[PDB]
């Protein structure tokens, strides 16, 4: 049991936090609890302020800020700490009480209760040419000296810590995702039925995705090529809402289905970020620093109001795509395709 720490270069302002990772269940989110330690002998009248800031920064906004768009900011909450002005609210925390007793006097606590409707942390995949200060939705706990006319002096000596909210698995496997379709081309009387399924519903990062594909083709038409892929599409809503269609796992099957015949088998595609290094605009889990992290864990919502949640929502759906072959002007020139899509949620399990 050890506790994080982040001190100002001045050295007066230091902030202690129990954990840097906070998980948000559907019912409630774990509180952001911390303390701040100073030497008030140095400042006779300056105050101590601690804030939780959520920001939907960049995300290719700056390409259009010069005329079209702007960079917004999400929920921000403030608390004063130097004076116990309320003196009435003090739920306190076991960790907070223990740590205060450890440090002793001059340690002043703070507690934040995140509203559940806020989204989880996610960072857009930074392009190598951009090499900037990242992008996406971030949360941050940042502390200032306050109670003064000018904000220039304390801005440099203010402290800031990154904290990112994540969601874990709901450990409850649901109904088997199945997509069944029947296609009539209006040229033939014999249809083709495509039924695809996944092995289970919620997958763990790095676990192979197994797809059960069954095709029954009653007409003379065959399939030239079997197209199998999942895209990581994230709804950047309350915005332009340009849900981006970017694949993450690719599978080519040149197998052909004869007329009035069946094709029955299982494919294994695994999604991983090593191959998608060259890609840009991909959503990925919360980033603390330039240190890298894995693909974005799917964000689940409560089926109540289901209001358009502020920020980024990522959901995973894998397509199976049958393309038929038409030979026009001798060979080739086919331009038809029939695809169905299977949704799934990919996220880490809860550590014990």
């Amino acid at each position: 049991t050890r506790v994080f720490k982040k001190a100002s270069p001045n050295g007066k302002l230091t902030v202690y936090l129990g954990k840097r990772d906070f998980v948000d269940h559907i019912d409630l989110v774990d509180p952001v609890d911390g303390v701040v330690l100073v030497d008030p002998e140095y400042l006779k009248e300056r105050r101590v302020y601690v804030t939780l800031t959520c920001a939907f920064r960049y995300g290719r906004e700056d390409l259009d800020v010069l005329g079209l768009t702007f960079r917004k900011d999400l929920f921000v909450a403030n608390v004063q700490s130097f004076p116990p002005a309320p003196e009435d609210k003090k739920p306190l925390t076991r960790l907070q009480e223990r740590l205060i007793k450890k440090l002793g006097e001059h340690a002043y606590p703070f507690t934040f209760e995140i509203p559940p409707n806020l989204p989880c942390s996610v960072t857009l995949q930074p392009g190598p040419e951009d090499t900037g200060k990242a992008c996406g939705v971030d949360y941050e706990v940042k502390a200032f000296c306050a109670e003064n006319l000018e904000e220039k002096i304390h801005k440099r000596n203010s402290v800031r810590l990154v904290i990112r909210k994540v969601q874990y698995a709901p450990e409850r496997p649901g109904p088997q995702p199945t997509a069944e379709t029947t296609r009539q081309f209006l040229m033939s009387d014999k249809p083709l039925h495509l039924e695809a399924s996944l092995d289970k519903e919620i997958y763990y990062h790095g676990e192979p995705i197994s797809v059960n594909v069954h095709v029954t083709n009653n007409t003379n038409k065959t399939v030239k090529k079997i197209k199998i892929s999942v895209r990581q599409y994230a709804d950047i809503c309350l915005f332009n809402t340009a849900q981006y269609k970017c694949p993450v796992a690719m599978e080519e099957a040149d197998d052909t289905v004869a007329p009035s015949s069946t094709f029955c088998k299982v494919y294994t595609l695994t999604p991983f970020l090593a191959n998608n290094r060259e890609k840009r605009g991909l959503a990925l889990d919360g980033k603390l620093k330039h240190e890298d992290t894995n693909l974005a864990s799917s964000t689940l919502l409560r089926e109540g109001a289901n209001r358009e949640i502020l920020g980024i929502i990522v959901s995973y759906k894998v397509k199976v795509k049958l393309v038929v072959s038409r030979g026009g002007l001798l060979g080739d020139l086919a331009s038809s395709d029939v695809a169905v899509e299977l949704p799934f949620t990919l996220m880490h399990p809860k550590p014990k």
């Epitope: 050890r2 790095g206 695994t270 991983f272 090593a274």
Partner: single-chain antibody, 227 residues
């Protein structure tokens, strides 16, 4: 830099059923990212304590461990005939991973590995361990030495999900590691083996997400060099 980690005592004799402890120190702050390992002689080692506190599932509760600053200690409640072995401790907060010399205590879902034998100076060799029951994108695979009579030394690391491979300092460019994801196998190609690098080589598995030590340990194979 490189973290040098010193374990004490070098060896200890303790009767059966009594308290015993083994200590170790880290040159630079490692921040609870240390693990304690048990090694029966001849057999491959297994994990005891991860995250500097927790006990790996299946280990008896008679084992325990604690930390203080950089001095990290392990406590055994009683000594049974299943206990006497060599105990090791290793740090993983920064690459490279460095183990300790270790302590020899005396009373007084699997993996396969192959590709060992005799080498000549300037020769090459193929070590290969195949994974059964654990995925190649959901687990990182590491290769580690064991020279005869001295503690383990980290050799190489492969992480398929991230696409990065790491090599030990003394062996830059000497060999190459690569994973066949189709067959779920890990290949490691010695090229131009020296005379110093004589050891039995073990490959182990770790969780690619939220590293928690080298849980499933490969049996490994012995290799030697002669002119």
């Amino acid at each position: 830099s490189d973290i040098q980690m010193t374990q004490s005592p070098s060896s200890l004799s303790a009767s059966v059923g009594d308290r015993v402890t083994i200590t170790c120190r880290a040159s630079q702050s490692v921040s609870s990212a240390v693990a304690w390992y048990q090694q029966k002689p001849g057999k491959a080692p297994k994990l005891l304590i991860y995250s500097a506190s927790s006990l790996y599932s299946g280990v008896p509760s008679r084992f325990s461990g604690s930390r203080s600053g950089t001095d990290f200690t392990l406590t055994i409640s009683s000594l049974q005939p299943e206990d006497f072995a060599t105990y090791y401790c290793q740090q993983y907060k920064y690459v490279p991973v460095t183990f300790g010399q270790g302590t020899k205590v005396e009373i007084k879902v699997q993996l396969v590995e192959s590709g060992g034998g005799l080498v000549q100076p300037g020769g090459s060799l193929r070590l290969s361990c195949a994974a059964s029951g654990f995925n190649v994108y959901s687990s990182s695979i590491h290769w580690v030495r064991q020279a005869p009579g001295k503690g383990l030394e980290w050799v190489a690391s492969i992480s398929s999900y991230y696409g990065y491979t790491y090599y030990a300092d003394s062996v830059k460019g000497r060999f190459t590691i690569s994973a066949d994801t189709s067959k779920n196998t890990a290949y490691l190609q010695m090229n131009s083996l020296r005379a110093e690098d004589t050891a039995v080589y073990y490959c182990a598995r770790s969780r690619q997400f939220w590293y928690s030590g080298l849980d499933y340990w490969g049996q490994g194979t012995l290799v030697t060099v002669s002119s």
